[PDB]
Design a protein around this nucleic acid. Sequence first.
RNA 1: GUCUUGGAGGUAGAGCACUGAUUGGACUAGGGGCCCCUACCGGGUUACCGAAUUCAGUCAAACUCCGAAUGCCAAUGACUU
RNA 2: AUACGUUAAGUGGAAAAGGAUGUGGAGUUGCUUAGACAACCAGGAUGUUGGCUUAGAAGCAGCCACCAUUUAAAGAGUGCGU
RNA 3: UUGGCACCUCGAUGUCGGCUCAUCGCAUCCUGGGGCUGUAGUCGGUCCCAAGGGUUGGGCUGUUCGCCCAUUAAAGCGGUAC
Lengths: 36, 175, 138, 123
Amino acid sequence: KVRPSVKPICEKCKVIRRKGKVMVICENPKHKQKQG
Amino acid sequence: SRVGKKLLEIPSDVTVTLNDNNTVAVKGPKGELTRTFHPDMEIKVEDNVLTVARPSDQKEHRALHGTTRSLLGNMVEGVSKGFERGLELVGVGYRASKSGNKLVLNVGYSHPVEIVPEEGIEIEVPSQTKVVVKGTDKERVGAIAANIRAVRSPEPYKGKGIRYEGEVVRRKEGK
Amino acid sequence: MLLPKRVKYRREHRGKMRGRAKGGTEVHFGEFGIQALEASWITNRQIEAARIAMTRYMKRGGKVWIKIFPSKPYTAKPLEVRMGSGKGAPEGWVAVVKPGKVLFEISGVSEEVAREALRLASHKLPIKTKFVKREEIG
Amino acid sequence: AIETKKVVVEEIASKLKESKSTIIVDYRGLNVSEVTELRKQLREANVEFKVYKNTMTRRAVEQAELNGLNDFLTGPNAIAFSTEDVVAPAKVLNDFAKNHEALEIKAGVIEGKVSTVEEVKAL
RNA sequence: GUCUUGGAGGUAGAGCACUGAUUGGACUAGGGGCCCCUACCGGGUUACCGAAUUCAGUCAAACUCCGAAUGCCAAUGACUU
RNA sequence: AUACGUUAAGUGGAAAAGGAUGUGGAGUUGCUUAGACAACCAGGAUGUUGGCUUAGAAGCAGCCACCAUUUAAAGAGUGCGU
RNA sequence: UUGGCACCUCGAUGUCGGCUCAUCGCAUCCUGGGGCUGUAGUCGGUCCCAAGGGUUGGGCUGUUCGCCCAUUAAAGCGGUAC
Ligand SMILES: [Mg+2]
Ligand SMILES: [Mg+2]
Ligand SMILES: [Mg+2]
Ligand SMILES: [Mg+2]
Ligand SMILES: [Mg+2]
Ligand SMILES: [Mg+2]
Ligand SMILES: [Mg+2]
Ligand SMILES: [Mg+2]
Ligand SMILES: [Mg+2]
Ligand SMILES: [Zn+2]
């Protein structure tokens, strides 16, 4: 899932940075999203 | 708190030899390990005293001052007794088997698949439906186990294929 | 849809929009409000859209206060036609907003819920905003 | 840390009256088991079992300014308060025997508390 | 040309005193609607339209109780050209 | 060249609404050796699922403001749920 | 693309369709590699990387358009004085 506006959805999502990009990982794979 | 300050002890068998350029190695009851570290990062060892001296506080220094300590602990632990990790093989008729030194598996594919390890990592099939890697270096046995598991990742609708030794897998349903 | 009931003139200059707001820069009909930060026009329908969204989010306990009101009309010529020979026909209604104005005011609900409602309303306006609450000292 | 002093001196009045008291291991305690124990109190000794469980070992080392110099081996350790305000544990000893030999919460680290300088071998 | 001094004029800005536009309260006979019962009285409401009026609050190229900086017109002195 | 700061993108050497534990300053402010936040050991109910409706709804068919006591807290359910 | 302006060309810058020959972009039609799925499997839906190669014969109209017949893995969209 890719979009320019990434932000948590559930209560236990998380926000990180990999290779200068913004990412969000969570248990439910449907939440996994990456900015740009 | 902070991990870069916990002091490391040294069991009697562990004979670590500090060397210049942070090229320290180690000797113990299971073999040898060695790693060179960041130059400016300071390390000095006394008997059961691992002095991870950190230079001026920065970002990279605050990172290395922890990472080096963690790796040193891992290394002494490995050379003491090493690590391992089991591998579950669920299947419905899938099963593995040893051969010579290498390892072969028969998942539902139309042909056998084989994996050979390098030195220092012994594979062992205690039961023909269970595999256990074993070796001294933690990251290396991790890599080997990952290679194995990567042959047939588990399946959601029915737990099928390789699986780490105990872990929760999602579970949907078809109809 | 807000619009005057009768106007003197129907076509009218557009005019410049420099300088801060004359007055009405302090919330005094409620507890919280959004304050503009850069000049623009606000279309007749943008206002009602923001208002409906904001009032739906709330549990109707509070009340709202639309401060601004569209009065100036603006024209537009028909499509695919050369230039000149008469000003166009009146089309809609806008309301100029210079920085410092206070567009909306809420009162009757908790602080954070009003903050959320105002943030949700902000995303319908063509400008950048700021959440501001009632000056207690007056 | 306002009322910490307050309660740590307040426990003096409740500790000076009795002779004997008692301690209970803290963790592995079901609050269903805790409420069963509370109702067992209510039928045996209503609330006299000190179910006050919001204290840091300073509580007992500042209650030790008079006597009871033993919590140093219980404070930094599992603690579930209690006391024996009524006469010496001729009854609550066997009460605790039947309530923690195999019941709601284990006995484990329990050594009771001070009647006199002693700690164990009560009856 | 500059310094000094004196004039005419309603822009920028501001303001609601006039003319239009406009928000929220107070308050309303006149009740509109509900009705009690209104066939008709009289009465709660009037959801008043509550008209004003009043209390606060926003606007204007063809609104102004106000109103600059500049520019313009002269003077008699001075210093330069 | 001198002196002191900033940026790690080749920004420098092209753009917005919006998004973000990037990073430097200036603050405001709570908790805290009576021990903080983590992490690990514990637990998280009683006329009590109470007057409940749809099979228990015993956690969330969804009506009670499904309240009050045992304390040490338990919301007679945070979420996962079933 | 439909438009707006009228800056170059009126002592000449010759239109639309088709034929021969092509070449470039990628916002991808096929083939290659993946994430998620309201993905059982075989089919799919959507999004990410990818421009190497490939991308049809007829009927009706001057026709680009368009409809239809029969196939193919596929019968891509655009620029180069449409
Ligand atoms: Mg969105
Ligand atoms: Mg005002
Ligand atoms: Mg003006
Ligand atoms: Mg004027
Ligand atoms: Mg650049
Ligand atoms: Mg010629
Ligand atoms: Mg692409
Ligand atoms: Mg052509
Ligand atoms: Mg062109
Ligand atoms: Zn999530």
